[PDB]
Design a binder for this molecule. Structure first.
Ligand SMILES: *[C@@H]1O[C@H](CO)[C@@H](O[C@@H]2O[C@H](CO)[C@@H](O)[C@H](O)[C@H]2NC(C)=O)[C@H](O)[C@H]1NC(C)=O
Ligand SMILES: *[C@@H]1O[C@H](CO)[C@@H](O[C@@H]2O[C@H](CO)[C@@H](O)[C@H](O)[C@H]2NC(C)=O)[C@H](O)[C@H]1NC(C)=O
Ligand SMILES: *[C@@H]1O[C@H](CO)[C@@H](O[C@@H]2O[C@H](CO)[C@@H](O)[C@H](O)[C@H]2NC(C)=O)[C@H](O)[C@H]1NC(C)=O
Ligand SMILES: *[C@@H]1O[C@H](CO)[C@@H](O[C@@H]2O[C@H](CO)[C@@H](O)[C@H](O)[C@H]2NC(C)=O)[C@H](O)[C@H]1NC(C)=O
Ligand SMILES: *[C@@H]1O[C@H](CO)[C@@H](O[C@@H]2O[C@H](CO)[C@@H](O)[C@H](O)[C@H]2NC(C)=O)[C@H](O)[C@H]1NC(C)=O
Lengths: 346, 346, 346, 346, 346
């Protein structure tokens, strides 16, 4: 009746329970059903290609040696300090770079035991998980982060992991990300590792994150468009003001180069072309073409009177031709980069 | 009479005390009253959306098995090394990203036991707590940091947390923050977590922090206003000095772009518009309009004499119209951003 | 006679010594005298408002139960591994953000026991201590760092800390700081904490640090003075060279703005005005006034001959008036900021 | 038959097994065969000259005292908590700056014991390994990272390490690096340490990494080439526009200096010349020569008419001579830096 | 004969060996001879004034109680897990800011015991050691790093440290440093600490590091020399081109200021003058003098014809006088900073 003697009667030397033996030795494999609650989600860094998460991991399995029939209550929520005295699955995260438990006050490790021997085991973890990021279409990209739960020491004939049938991944209410939107749907997949040591169980969960475009509109696109429009001002300046137009061209080209360099400041040094790179390259080509247009005008207007009329015609043609070509480029760029974004994330 | 035998007579194998059993087993839930002393408060980072605090956490509860009637003194302040031999609540901080205890010399873990079994337990902690920050109205914003104290392994029928009736949150005297002002009032709320594992107790405390505006006046607003005034100098320069006025416009526009980029250097990449963004955008529009005004003057004054008088009229009109419009914008901006700040923090 | 049996005869089950009981139970409080040797001193960061120190902490007290009369030698320097078997004071550092012990080879924890029971206990620590910094007069400021030694679990009726009468704070010979000068005198004060848990002993030591001005002369003051002198060159250029003088004014103003922004790069975002801020503001006002002077000259000289003579008079007056006013400002600035520095540090 | 008594019958006080004695005491040395699975590979930093890896390390050896003949199954995959009760080799990584084990849930330490006493021991590690990098030919370099497995406490007469005959190094499928390509072939070598303490076994594995050139084309080469082409525009401007051409030369030279400084931002301060340094130096020489060409033209054209024709001839010659010389330099540079890259990596 | 009983017969309760007593109690002090193997050497940071090293530390002493006469072999290389059961010296590093042991696989702690009781104890450590750096002559300086090995708990009458007579400091073959050259000779000195707690043994080793000058030639000296040569181009431009020459002077002065600021980017904020500071100051003075020369020419040439001839004479004199004075300064600077470097390092 007392609780103290029941605790060590269930598991102990008198009971003969061995925590080094899985519940069904030399029998069917242990079936562990897992679910995850995401308390926080952030620190998504493209430079290191990883993200930090904080979760409650819940594992449920069955231990026949832990079945009791004395206490009337079906479930026993006991003290989370006898985890060392019972068998537990050897779960680990395959793509984890860094993981830690939480020891604030009492370690966060809930354990409930049912009448039939069902064990529920909940533990709070902080993980840093690697995420290979495809940075093509970078300002308008969608990334897929994965989380793999794998057995390290037991093969498929001893330990099998399964996702819970209902709500395997829950997210804390009000969880928002400053840079990304987390899609409501989450993919559950069956990884299965094959090493030279054998076959090991694995379960995978995939989160989809869409980058928000407002910051890049404020920071990169609008300043570059302003530089292009500023370079167009040269066409309305008197053709005899050589220092003015030449300085306009120089400053616009150099500023465009600086902005192109700065657009990849917080990104890994990937060796393919991104969407922002295409935008910056076209803007640089536009400002360079404006400077070359003035160079042609200056060269033509001193060939001595059709040489003056020809330069005036070049300026008047450019005044309308540059914005029209830029508008056509903008239409094509935005249409094709909002059409690629209609490709299925899967 | 001796202290040594009393210490292990109160809790030990002879006494039969079990630290794995809560004080009132199969009875009413344990009522733990908590209070907090804030020793330090700082490291408020908008990029990571967290703040670091150092606290003394005091928990008081009642243990009937710990009631004694031998020693005359009502309270016993004993050695803080037998915390492992008594039951303690499993408190944890829900929004904590990182927590640590202090082990300098002797671990800081005071324990007092009263005659009636009242236990007072004080522990020094350093916490990093996540704070979701609303950066709209950024230079003139007010943030609300929260701290949640929650039970991990016990449900509401076993463990209930309550704030102390008098002085639940105390702050160290002379505690100041370089960037923020901490409001005297603190909000105490009742969170209550509902997971698939059950219902768990929670208590919340909210601190209000008002950002001080002096640094942003020195660093961002005044330099931008100086750039705008500098761009106004062009209107008083001779209209024939094309390189001078064109260079003025170019340099002011490029400097304005650089300042706008630098105004978000230490901020998260949020995708909404802040107050400083509106200010920078309007200043950029003003300097761009000054350059376009000179472009119009230069184009008009060479159409050949009303063409010269018209350009002179444009310059004389701009000389008065630009500062007046800027003053009207300043009045509206500051009035509406000191009117929004009158909205109740709650 | 053997040492091995004497070691556990002094403290052990046979002796009846209890390490959980203070030396004079139910009697006068234990008087612990402390002294500190500073091995290193550095990492003074204004952004985080803390400094890192490395110390040897020596505590001396009396334990009557540890008095022996067998060995002829008065002092016994024993192995530093039986610290767990004797009572020790629960000292801690109130303003410490981070502390660590040193475990290189054998842990650094000397223990000597005298014939009369006097215990000397020396331990090597590394501390990060918070220092609230008053950054007014920043380039020519004097800071006061404090170190508080406080009892966590014992009140004044059980434990009292005192500084040693002679040499309570010693500094390692040749200890220098790259940015600061450490004053020879150190202040010893009596803090005493009053919480809702009671009254706790505290002792405080204050170090005074004077910032050295050579780096700021090389880095900030001289470049700004050079920019001001460069802006004065405009007064000697021909008044018809509008692009030259206008470009001089623009570049000087923009460079002054950049230097003013950079002068607060490694400082916390405080919301008051510092001395370097006043210097930068006055230099910016000077260069802006030079540009406005040229704007006035350019406007006046085209009003058509007294209009040319008047502009020449303005230039000739400015040539002498600008350096004289700057010299007067320099005299006042340096005099009042070397007069404020004569205020007593206490 | 029971597992519990078999576990401590194999190794324990009853068996007489001593974990402090190697399997063949006073006999032939223990032959440990090792293999490695690389789970992740990244964080290759030139500044610190190290790279971070995550591996599964598998060691196989023979322990005659662990041979059993009771259980029918040839292999026993037991609980990974009795590693302390058996002898294990003292492997360590010679070039490791930082190493850590993984304790997520159950520590990742698989152990299998065969009928004949063969022990297979697999452990998950995260290593930071130093890599001395030869940065000559930096944008087009190939680096060789090494990993050394060495015995610390046993000499060659007690412990010998060998690579597994088949698949000693496996890489996870889909493992990619943002900056480098990892060559399929891996070199296996026999290091052998000779200290004053004796001779110690060592085995080495070498990975070859080729840097991808796309990022440096986008970031460094193309902007510099654009600056050079921009400097060529001066030759087509009217020779009387002195401020325009002089400003072109100044801006191109200063931008070239800034790009040369920025090309070594994320590199160690090595004291030899790299390929990117040669490219930047030649580009700087080209833009400086363009400015000096205009200086010569300006000086010649005012010697007063053959002085005007001579300056025109200089400009017309430069118009064709500068791009031709730059093209010849580009041909030579790229040919010799894609010829050096044909040198055998070994 | 068996090894297992011999291991605990040598040290154990049966033997009576006490690890808390030094080998010769109440006798002559223990003489520990030390030597060091440097596996790696790097991370020399001037900002924090420290360097990181990785070493094997070998200590040899004599323990009479450990002398055996049973096993025929003179030396026993036993398992490195019984270090807790024998006495060891309490060595520590006086100038260490951070130290860590290596626990990869089996902890790296070799122990050999000889027939006569000689103990050899080797341990792998990673240290961060503070190094006070004299940054006068910074680009061409030589630094001296020290390493102190000191006893913490034992005085000179109990424990004495000595360097090994032959090869006390060995360096791994092929050890190179990107920024420094490590001199072959190493100084061995006798520190001896005198505290208020007594006299403590210490041994010191000094390494000499010479900074390599190639990086600073590429990064700082050559760009500044190019800026000076660029400023000399103004003397060959027509004296009537005021915007061109004035812009040349402005850009050269501002770029020189920026380079002077950037030359101390990765250095502590010391308050004395370095060699690079002298170089930058003289270059800044040269470019400022060129601008002032043009200002004088512009002022003189409009005093209205001897006023034109005088300005032409000033320009022609400057054309030869500026490079000659710069060459003389270069000769003096390099001669005296390669003469100071001939001072003996000791
Ligand atoms: C774990 O789940 C697996 C899969 O459902 C179970 O394996 C099945 O067991 C039933 C009952 O004995 C057999 O009829 C099936 O043929 C098995 N299928 C496979 C693929 O093995 C297994 O028994 C479960 N383990 C436990 C302990 O209940
Ligand atoms: C903890 O506090 C709760 C709330 O005051 C107590 O619950 C009440 O107990 C009284 C006395 O038995 C009952 O009359 C009330 O109906 C209870 N209310 C509720 C909502 O449960 C509880 O008894 C306290 N626990 C202890 C150990 O004193
Ligand atoms: C610790 O120091 C205090 C202060 O000197 C001692 O308290 C005094 O003790 C003497 C001797 O009994 C009394 O006459 C005084 O009245 C006490 N003064 C106060 C303010 O308490 C105390 O006894 C010392 N403790 C020990 C163990 O020696
Ligand atoms: C480990 O491998 C070595 C090398 O194969 C073995 O050494 C050989 O052992 C055989 C059998 O006794 C001898 O005939 C050879 O002369 C040995 N060669 C050398 C170079 O020593 C060694 O026996 C193996 N160890 C074990 C325990 O099997
Ligand atoms: C450690 O070394 C010291 C110095 O050599 C030894 O001290 C000497 O011991 C000899 C032999 O007894 C004496 O003759 C000398 O007078 C001692 N000199 C000094 C300065 O003390 C010491 O004996 C050595 N310790 C051991 C255990 O051998």
């Amino acid at each position: 009746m007392s609780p103290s003697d029941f605790l060590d009667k269930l598991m102990g030397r008198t009971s003969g329970y061995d925590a080094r033996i899985r519940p069904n030795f030399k029998g069917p494999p242990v079936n562990v059903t897992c679910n995850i609650f995401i308390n926080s989600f952030g620190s998504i860094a493209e430079t290191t290609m990883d993200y930090r998460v904080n979760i409650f991991l819940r594992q449920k399995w069955n231990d026949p040696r832990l079945a009791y029939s004395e206490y009337p209550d079906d479930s026993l929520d006991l003290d989370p300090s006898m985890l060392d005295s019972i068998w537990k699955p050897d779960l680990f995260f395959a793509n984890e770079k860094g993981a830690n438990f939480h020891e604030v006050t009492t370690d966060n490790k809930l354990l409930r035991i049912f009448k039939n021997g069902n064990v529920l085991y909940s533990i709070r973890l902080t993980l840093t998980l690697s995420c290979p990021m495809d940075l093509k279409n970078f300002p308008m990209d969608v990334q897929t982060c994965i989380m793999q739960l794998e057995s390290f020491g037991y093969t498929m004939n001893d330990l099998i992991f399964e996702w819970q049938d209902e709500a395997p991944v829950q997210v804390a209410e009000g969880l928002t990300l400053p840079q990304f939107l987390l899609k409501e749907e989450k993919d559950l997949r069956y990884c299965t590792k094959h090493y030279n040591t054998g076959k090991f169980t694995c379960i995978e969960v995939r989160f989809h994150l869409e980058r928000q475009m407002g910051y890049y509109l404020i920071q990169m696109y609008i300043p570059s468009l302003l530089i292009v429009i500023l370079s167009w001002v040269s066409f309305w300046i008197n053709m005899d003001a050589a220092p003015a137009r030449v300085a306009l061209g120089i400053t616009t080209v150099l500023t465009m180069t600086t902005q192109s360099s700065g657009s990849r400041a917080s990104l890994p040094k990937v060796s393919y072309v991104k969407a922002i790179d295409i935008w910056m390259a076209v803007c640089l080509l536009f400002v360079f073409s404006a400077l070359l247009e003035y160079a042609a005008v200056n060269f033509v207007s001193r060939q001595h009177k059709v040489f003056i009329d020809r330069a005036k015609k070049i300026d008047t043609i450019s005044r309308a031709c540059f914005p029209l070509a830029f508008l056509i480029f903008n239409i094509f760029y935005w249409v094709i980069y909002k059409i690629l974004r209609h490709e299925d994330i899967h």
